[PDB]
Structures are given as C-alpha cells and as structure tokens.
Design a protein around this ligand. Structure first.
Ligand SMILES: Cc1ccc(C(N)=O)cc1-c1nnc2ccc(CCc3ccc(F)cc3F)cn12
Length: 337
C-alpha cells in the first residue's frame, strides 16, 4: 500500500497516494469531482475523478460498478481508460470512496468550438478519431447514448478521446428515435450525434438547438423531412405516430444547399449520418471507409474490442452486493505497466 495524504478542495475532501501531486480542481464533472494532478511515477499529467456518493443507493452503486467495469475494459487511443484506480479504504467494511485516474487531455471539444470554426482538414481528423473510437465501443456491444462535445476530451495536439460511453443540452445531439421515446434503438444513435457534431464544426453553429423534446423533433424534421411511408410503419407508439403525422409534411432539404461551400465529401457523409430511419443510417465502420477520410483511413489500424461481459446489467442486487463487486474490481486492477 502506498502512502496517502489528505486535503480539502472546493468543499470536497481528497485522499490520494503521494505519487499524485499538485491537485487542482478542474470541475464538477458528473457524479463526481475532478482534479488535474501530476503523476510522479510516469512524469505525465493525469485527471483524477473522485466519485460522488458511490453507494448512496442501488442506483448509485450499480452506476459505480458500471463505470469501473467500463473504464477497466476500454483500451483504445480514442477512448478514455484507466491508468489507476484506488481507495484509501484498508478493507471492504471501510470502503466508501473510489478514485479513477486517466491521462489528462486538458479540455473538451466545446472549449475549442468557442470563437472558432474549423477548416476541413481539422474536421476530418477530429471526426475520424470519434468514429475510430465508436467503432471500438460499438464492437463491444456498448452504445454511448449521450455523445456531445462536452463528452469529448481533446489535447493541444488535437488528439481526441470519447468520455462516458456506456453510462450544452444532451437533447441537441440526440437521435430523433430517442427524442420520441423509443427503447428499441440501435448503435447508430451515436452516429446521429457525430453528424450533429460534425455539422457544428463545419458551420460554427448548433445544428438543432431545440428548447425541449418537441421543439427538438420539429427542428430535426425541418432539415431531414417528415417520416415517409417506410419509416412510419416501424413506429409502434400511437402518440408518436399521431404527433408526427399531425405535423405539416416537410420535405428533406438539400444538404448541398444547407452546408453550401463545405467539402462536398463532407456533405455526402453528413447526409448518410443524419438519416431519420436508423436502419438506414451509416455505421461507424462504414463511415470510416468513406472517401472523406481517405487521408486518415487505414483498415489495419482501426481495431475492435475484446468481448465485454455486460451480464451484470440485467441483475437487481443489493447495495452491499454492488459495493463488494466494485471492491473486487478495485483490488484486481492491473495497469498498463
Ligand atoms: C474534459 C476536460 C475538460 C477540462 C479539463 C481541464 N480544465 O483540465 C480537463 C478535461 C479532461 N481532460 N482529460 C480528461 C479525462 C477524463 C475526464 C473526465 C473525468 C474522469 C474520468 C475518468 C477518469 F479516470 C478520470 C477522470 F478525471 C476529463 N478530462
């Protein structure tokens, strides 16, 4: 066991091994707080997240296990994984805190979109990396479900990693099949979000800035047109169909016109990503082979993930059970060294 030291930071207490130095708060970053630190072992900067109230309820306990399992499995240059996981607890009975550590990128995608609008070459590289990460995530039977600029960490080299897979409105980037309230979507839910991100990097504005779920659907349909016969026949929900079909029929707009002087290859990719019918939407793997990425695509360097056991997802267990399981995962952790 290494030696731990203690400090208060922004009302929050931090108990970490001495090898992590110079902790500086960087945010309240979802179900926890986050510090940038210096890892004396490697000489590299890291991000340390202290989970908030990890065993507060069955919901929190399952979430904590889910995150730790997910982060332990992700081993890909475009997805965050773990350099370290630790707890100051000496035993299971004293176990109430989890700390996770990963390479510090230092910003999200949004932290660059401000005051800037990107050239084609940078859009190609950023989206290529997103898709490269999604191919890997999707190959593990994981759907991100909340891809958005704030969930993409980006360093000064413009290298990118996807955050928070598996677990600035989310609404703005979410596929229409999940706006409508359908729980039989597929992995191309995430491809829609990529399309919204790409559009925004090219134009400099949020593609679908809706003020609620209904307005969001309305903004989406103004661009992509209202459901045709084929799609309408796949919708079970009477309320969903009745609503959609109670709207004034709207045609698909010309993407070449909406995205005027963008690379026409980018416009072609965008029209294959932002298709209403998710059965017809391009996959991450297919998108990687698209002509837009000819300068980046290498099919021998776009790997897939090892088998991911998500059987825990169907299980209804007690807090002490999720807690003990999380504990075992902390103790069995093997780093990249
Ligand atoms: C996204 C972001 C935005 C701003 C800043 C910053 N101001 O330093 C940094 C980042 C930032 N740069 N790199 C990361 C890696 C992860 C996280 C999310 C929190 C997290 C998840 C898993 C872990 F193991 C450890 C963690 F800390 C935020 N990061």
């Amino acid at each position: 066991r290494p030696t731990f030291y203690r400090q208060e930071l922004n009302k929050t207490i931090w108990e970490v091994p001495e090898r992590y130095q110079n902790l500086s708060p960087v945010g309240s970053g979802a179900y926890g707080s986050v510090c940038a630190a210096f890892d004396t072992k490697t000489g590299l900067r890291v991000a340390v997240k202290k989970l908030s109230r990890p065993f507060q309820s069955i919901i929190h306990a399952k979430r904590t296990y889910r995150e730790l399992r997910l982060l332990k499995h992700m081993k890909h240059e475009n997805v965050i994984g773990l350099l370290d996981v630790f707890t100051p607890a000496r035993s299971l009975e004293e176990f109430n805190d989890v700390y996770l550590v990963t390479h510090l990128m230092g910003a999200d995608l949004n932290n660059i979109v401000k005051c800037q609008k990107l050239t084609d070459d940078h859009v190609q590289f950023l989206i290529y990396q997103i898709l490269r990460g999604l191919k890997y995530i999707h190959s593990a039977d994981i759907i991100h479900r909340d891809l958005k600029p704030s969930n993409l960490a980006v360093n000064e080299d413009c290298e990118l990693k996807i955050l928070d897979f598996g677990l600035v409105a989310t609404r703005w980037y979410r596929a229409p099949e999940i706006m409508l309230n359908w729980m039989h979507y597929n992995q191309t839910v995430d491809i829609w979000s990529v399309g919204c991100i790409m559009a925004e990097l090219l134009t400099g504005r949020t593609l679908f800035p809706g003020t609620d779920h209904i307005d969001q659907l309305k903004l989406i349909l103004r661009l992509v047109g209202t459901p045709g016969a084929e799609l309408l026949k796949k919708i079970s929900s009477e309320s969903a169909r009745n609503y959609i079909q109670s709207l004034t029929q709207m045609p698909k707009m010309n993407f070449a016109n909406v995205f005027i002087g963008a690379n026409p290859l980018a416009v072609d990719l965008l029209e294959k990503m932002l298709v209403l019918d998710s059965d017809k939407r391009i996959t991450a793997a297919q998108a990687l082979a698209h002509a837009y990425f000819a300068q980046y695509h290498d099919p021998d360097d776009e790997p897939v993930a090892d088998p991911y056991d998500q059987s825990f997802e169907s299980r209804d267990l007690l807090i002490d059970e999720w807690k003990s399981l999380t504990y075992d995962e902390v103790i069995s952790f093997v780093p990249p060294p």
